[PDB]
């Protein structure tokens, strides 16, 4: 249910060349800081794009981050928020309540006898993000279902006889305090959010907090430059329904270049490393960002773009690591 | 399920197919396998064979020789071992997927469970019983119990799991094909300690396994351009007909080639082609069908290639070595040579079969040809 | 049960050989081995002079290296058996007045090690006692991948040193690297694999069945011990004893090897169709029981 | 062509049209 009106806005503000910091500044207006962890937030939300080849394999086409670091960076609010963008979400909170399900679960209720056949939270959220918050306390059962679900994306159930295969593609956002090393290895990016000291940015964010504190009194006070939230959801609905994107000769040439140097510089350093799946992971961002624009084709800005976040997250968290 | 029927077309197709390529064969069907892939001739090779399969000899006395081939894939990570596992689930019938734990309490084997609201006890199936005559995609074979060990050691030997406990004594038919893949544990593999020390098991289970190939990943700038250059082809494919920038909706007569695109395919100056999946499969169906018979000369061959191979091991081996060469290499050898002897359509087994299968042998073994 | 032809059929001299051969002629070699699992299938006979039991039940256990056709033994001896449960390491009851195979036997539980040894020596099951008459048949493997003759028994193949004691025979494979042995298992396989069926021999295999009313047939008599004939088992046991104390490195002559001698002689005579246990009985089982001893040497 | 699935007798078990 979309007006053309909405459309011709969605036109009008694709077509602007910073569309992309606008959404990275619109991602969580109250949280302060992290503008490298909203642009990550905004490639997960447009996601990439789904492929199905003549052998009937598909590839696919999410994106999936991690969050590590310690506790009082705002993880929790930062997800919440999340998931109140994404058309299709999900909030699970590991070990509360089980986490929701995270299973599809075969229940007998007492009383009619009859067999309830209940899909996980997984498969409720299909073709959409499932955050999970404290992501090392999960159950082991729930462990079974996300390494499943993140490889093959079918959930499976075979308890009492009945045995189907329910369906699950969904971008996993999680965030964890500390280190299941197969499930980080699944993953796309993965944020060390270290802290800083420096004085300005400590004093800013005390100011920041004593005036909201102070002006819950005047919580109806707006922000500018950001989108609404309901804008927010319209225009990433339009542009996962509208726009998939491929990459283009130039930057499959430039992405090769710097594949082959970084894994000769790789085991050069280990004689004194980057794979396959990292380099299908960088063809997925690439691909978000030119779905982010409305674009049939990804530049090699977007390819540079894609290798500067790879850089920021995945290497500097193996370095540090 | 789905009835793969025949006409007579088909047949004329099929025997076609046999007669323009009464050679190299073989060849063909492992390259056009699994065309995403790059590379793993050998692995492709097997894994044909392992979807034909052998045959089964039932002699006066009752004892019974199973027919089936077992693959094992102990490699690095990121190396597409699971690619390979999909490719098969997709492409034979009958194939049921596990994650190497195994299904609930069930586990891969049969067990009598319990219901917990009435108390009474059922015995469900394992994934290993379900699969009976099929071929089952283990998954990590490492995250396995020690119960599951056990029970395998059987499953895999007898053919028939047999519980007795609970008062419910019975017997079931598990006469399935394995294939299975897992990681090291110590992150990398490590090529001078052996492959049960590298996995982190036992090493009956190895003697179990009829092929153990081990894929390591290599560095070399050359594979890592072919290797690139090939998943960013795959990757810019477009389905012909649509038209640029579309996304996909997600909704919720045989043909002996495919049609040339070079994105795919690669321009090999047209040089290069690729049979089609639904010919595959009512060629492995029709392969199936058939049952060889061993000849003289095949016989000879073969103890005299088991000889040597033997003899070979006993000197050298100063490098690490996969497995050691037991009497089992005399019946896989006898499995390859009927399964290359099914592809190829003919009735008796010759001399060109058991080359086939001594080169597959000797490179799962030795690891490098002849 | 039987006809007389039957009888005059198997009632030539040397048929002991013959129905030793006739077990499981798909598998290349092992004759002492076969003979031994013969004779585990017909078993001993049980005695109560002056009220003292002695039991007849024969256990035998097969070790060596992995993938030399235990697990085929196994399972022909647990099919032609009358009554018999197979299984692995991780029941007893059910196998009672019958063969309990037991395959992958290092895998067990101790705990459950403990019964094994009530059982192997009181035949009973003390929780209210259930009979638990069954000869076990075992199959073990090395632990480190090969066995090594330089370590003993118990480190090769990690098991409580008097547990191994108690079987009645131990038989040890060890796996050979000889050029002409390989060609011909070779030769054997394929024509196994090609014809159906096992190679021409010089006797004709006995069929399943016919094996079966002679092993019942055999059961039928009880032969005894004569006194005569003991004094040579005087001499052969002190001579025995006299080699043991030579060199104390293996397990020693003790009670148990007497006794196994005096119940393979007793077995030995029960196939014969004799009631009296003669010399040639007392040979073959010192024969028997030299056969395995040189076995475990390497 | 059926009969050359009867030739390797194979045409028996087949499903045909
Ligand atoms: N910009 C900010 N940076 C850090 N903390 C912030 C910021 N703005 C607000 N906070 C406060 O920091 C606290 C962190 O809350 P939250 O539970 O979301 O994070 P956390 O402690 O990292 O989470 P967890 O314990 O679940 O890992 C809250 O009290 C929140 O109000
Ligand atoms: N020739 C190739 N060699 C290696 N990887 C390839 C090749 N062609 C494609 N790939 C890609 O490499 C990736 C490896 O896939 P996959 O996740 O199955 O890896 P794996 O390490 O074998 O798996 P597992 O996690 O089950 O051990 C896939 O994205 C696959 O498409
Ligand atoms: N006389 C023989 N000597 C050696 N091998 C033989 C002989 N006859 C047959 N074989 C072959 O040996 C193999 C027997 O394997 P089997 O599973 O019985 O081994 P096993 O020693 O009982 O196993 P494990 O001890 O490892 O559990 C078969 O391939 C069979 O064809």
Same mark, same amino acid.
């Given at each position: 249910?979309?007006?053309?009106?909405?459309?011709?806005?969605?036109?009008?503000?694709?077509?602007?060349?910073?569309?992309?910091?606008?959404?990275?500044?619109? $991602?969580?207006?109250?949280?302060?800081?992290?503008?490298? $962890?909203?642009?990550?937030?905004?490639?997960?939300?447009?996601?990439?794009?789904?492929?199905?080849?003549?052998?009937? *394999?598909?590839?696919?086409?999410?994106?999936?981050?991690?969050?590590?670091?310690?506790?009082?960076?705002?993880?929790?609010?930062? *997800?919440?928020?999340?998931?109140?963008?994404?058309? $299709?979400?999900?909030?699970?909170?590991?070990?509360?309540?089980?986490?929701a399900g995270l299973t599809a679960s075969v229940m007998r209720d007492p009383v009619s006898r009859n067999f309830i056949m209940e899909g996980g939270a997984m498969v409720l959220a299909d073709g959409g993000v499932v955050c999970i918050d404290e992501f090392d306390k999960m159950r082991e059962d729930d462990r079974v279902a996300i390494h499943e679900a993140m490889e093959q994306q079918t959930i499976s159930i075979a308890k009492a006889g009945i045995t189907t295969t329910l369906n699950s593609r969904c971008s996993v956002l999680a965030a964890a305090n500390s280190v299941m090393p197969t499930i980080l290895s699944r993953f796309d990016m993965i944020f060390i959010v270290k802290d800083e000291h420096n004085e300005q940015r400590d004093m800013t964010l005390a100011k920041h907090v004593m005036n909201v504190h102070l002006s819950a009194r005047t919580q109806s006070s707006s922000v500018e430059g950001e989108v609404d939230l309901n804008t927010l959801k319209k225009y990433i609905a339009y542009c996962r329904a509208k726009c998939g994107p491929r990459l283009s000769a130039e930057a499959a040439e430039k992405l090769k270049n710097r594949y082959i140097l970084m894994r000769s510089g790789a085991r050069e350093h280990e004689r004194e490393p980057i794979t396959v799946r990292q380099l299908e992971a960088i063809v997925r961002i690439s691909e978000s960002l030119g779905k982010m624009k409305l674009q049939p084709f990804a530049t090699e800005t977007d390819v540079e773009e894609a290798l500067r976040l790879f850089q920021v997250s995945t290497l500097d968290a193996a370095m540090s690591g | 399920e789905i009835a793969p029927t025949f006409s007579a077309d088909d047949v004329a197709k099929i025997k076609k197919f046999c007669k323009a390529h009464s050679k190299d064969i073989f060849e063909h069907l492992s390259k056009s396998l699994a065309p995403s892939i790059h590379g793993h001739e050998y692995i492709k090779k097997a894994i044909l064979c392992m979807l034909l399969g052998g045959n089964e000899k039932v002699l006066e006395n009752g004892t019974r020789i199973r027919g089936d081939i077992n693959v094992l894939l102990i490699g690095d990570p990121s190396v597409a071992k699971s690619q390979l596992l999909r490719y098969v689930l997709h492409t034979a019938p009958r194939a049921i997927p596990t994650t190497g734990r195994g299904s609930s309490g069930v586990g891969l084997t049969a067990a009598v469970t319990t219901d917990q609201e009435t108390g009474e006890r059922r015995l469900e199936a394992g994934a290993m019983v379900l699969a009976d005559r099929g071929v089952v995609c283990i998954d990590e074979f490492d995250k396995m119990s020690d119960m599951d060990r056990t029970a395998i050691h059987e499953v895999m030997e007898q053919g028939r799991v047999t519980i007795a406990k609970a008062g419910i004594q019975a017997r079931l038919n598990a006469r399935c094909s394995v294939?299975?893949?897992?990681?090291?544990?110590?992150?990398r593999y490590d090529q001078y300690r052996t492959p049960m020390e590298n996995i982190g098991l036992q090493d009956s289970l190895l003697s179990r396994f009829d092929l153990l190939f081990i894929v390591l990943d290599k560095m070399?700038?050359?594979?890592?351009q072919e290797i690139a250059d090939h998943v960013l082809r795959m990757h810019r494919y477009r389905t012909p007909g649509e038209q640029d920038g579309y996304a996909l909706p997600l909704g919720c007569e045989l043909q002996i080639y495919e049609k040339?695109?070079?994105?795919?395919?690669?321009?090999?100056?047209?040089?290069?082609?690729?049979?089609?999946?639904? /010919?595959?499969? =009512?060629?492995?169906?029709?392969?199936?069908?058939?049952?060889?018979?061993?000849?003289?000369?095949?016989?000879?061959?073969?103890?005299?290639?088991?000889?040597?191979?033997?003899?070979?091991?006993?000197?050298?081996?100063?490098?690490?070595?996969?497995?050691?060469?037991?009497?089992?290499?005399? &019946?896989?050898?006898?499995?390859?040579?009927?399964?290359?002897? =099914?592809?190829?359509?003919? =009735?008796?087994? &010759?001399?060109?079969?058991?080359?086939?299968?001594? &080169?597959?042998?000797? /490179?799962?073994? /030795? =690891?490098?040809?002849? | 049960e039987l006809s007389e032809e039957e009888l005059?059929?198997?009632?030539?001299?040397?048929?002991?050989?013959?129905?030793?051969?006739?077990?499981?002629?798909?598998?290349?070699?092992?004759?002492?081995?076969?003979?031994?699992?013969?004779?585990?299938?017909?078993?001993?006979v049980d005695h109560s002079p002056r009220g003292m039991k002695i039991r007849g039940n024969i256990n035998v256990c097969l070790m060596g290296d992995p993938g030399v056709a235990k697990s085929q033994l196994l399972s022909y001896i647990d099919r032609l058996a009358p009554r018999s449960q197979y299984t692995t390491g991780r029941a007893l009851v059910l196998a009672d007045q019958g063969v309990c195979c037991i395959d992958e036997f290092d895998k067990m539980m101790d705990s459950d090690r403990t019964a094994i040894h009530e059982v192997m020596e009181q035949q009973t099951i003390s929780?209210?006692?259930?009979?638990?008459?069954?000869?076990?048949?075992?199959?073990?493997?090395?632990?480190?991948?090969?066995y090594n003759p330089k370590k003993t028994v118990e480190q090769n193949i990690q098991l409580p040193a008097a547990l191994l004691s108690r079987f009645d025979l131990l038989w040890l494979i060890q796996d050979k690297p000889d050029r002409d042995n390989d060609l011909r298992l070779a030769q054997h396989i394929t024509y196994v694999h090609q014809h159906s069926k096992q190679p021409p021999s010089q006797f004709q295999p006995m069929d399943m069945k016919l094996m079966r009313r002679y092993?019942?047939?055999?059961?039928?008599?009880?032969?005894?011990?004569?006194?005569?004939?003991?004094?040579?088992?005087?001499?052969?046991?002190?001579?025995?004893?006299?080699?043991?104390?030579?060199?104390?490195?293996?397990?020693?002559?003790?009670?148990?090897?007497?006794?196994?001698?005096?119940?393979?002689?007793?077995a030995l005579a029960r196939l014969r169709l004799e009631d009296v246990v003669?010399?040639?009985?007392?040979?073959?089982?010192?024969?028997?029981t030299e056969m395995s001893k040189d076995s475990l040497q390497g | 062509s059926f009969s050359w699935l009867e030739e390797m007798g194979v045409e028996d078990k087949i499903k045909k049209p």
């Open positions: 249910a979309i007006t053309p009106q909405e459309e011709e806005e969605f036109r009008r503000l694709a077509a602007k060349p910073d569309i992309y910091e606008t959404v990275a500044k619109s $991602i969580a207006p109250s949280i302060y800081g992290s503008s490298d $962890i909203k642009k990550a937030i905004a490639c997960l939300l447009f996601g990439g794009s789904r492929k199905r080849l003549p052998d009937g *394999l598909t590839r696919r086409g999410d994106v999936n981050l991690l969050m590590l670091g310690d506790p009082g960076t705002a993880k929790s609010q930062l *997800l919440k928020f999340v998931e109140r963008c994404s058309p $299709i979400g999900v909030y699970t909170s590991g070990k509360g309540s089980s986490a | 294939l299975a893949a897992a990681n090291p544990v110590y992150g070399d700038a050359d594979n890592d040339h695109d070079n994105l795919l395919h690669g321009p090999r100056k047209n040089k290069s082609k690729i049979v089609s999946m639904q /010919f595959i499969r =009512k060629y492995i169906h029709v392969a199936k069908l058939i049952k060889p018979v061993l000849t003289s000369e095949a016989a000879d061959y073969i103890s005299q290639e088991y000889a040597k191979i033997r003899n070979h091991d006993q000197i050298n081996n100063d490098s690490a070595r996969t497995m050691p060469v037991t009497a089992r290499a005399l &019946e896989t050898m006898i499995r390859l040579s009927t399964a290359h002897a =099914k592809v190829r359509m003919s =009735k008796t087994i &010759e001399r060109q079969d058991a080359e086939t299968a001594l &080169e597959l042998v000797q /490179f799962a073994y /030795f =690891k490098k040809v002849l | 005059r059929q198997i009632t030539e001299e040397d048929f002991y050989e013959k129905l030793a051969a006739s077990i499981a002629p798909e598998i290349y070699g092992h004759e002492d081995v076969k003979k031994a699992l013969l004779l585990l299938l017909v078993g001993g929780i209210t006692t259930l009979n638990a008459r069954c000869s076990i048949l075992a199959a073990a493997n090395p632990a480190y991948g090969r092993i019942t047939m055999c059961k039928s008599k009880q032969p005894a011990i004569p006194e005569s004939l003991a004094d040579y088992l005087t001499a052969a046991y002190v001579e025995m004893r006299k080699e043991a104390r030579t060199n104390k490195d293996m397990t020693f002559t003790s009670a148990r090897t007497l006794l196994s001698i005096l119940r393979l002689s007793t003669e010399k040639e009985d007392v040979n073959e089982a010192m024969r028997l | -």
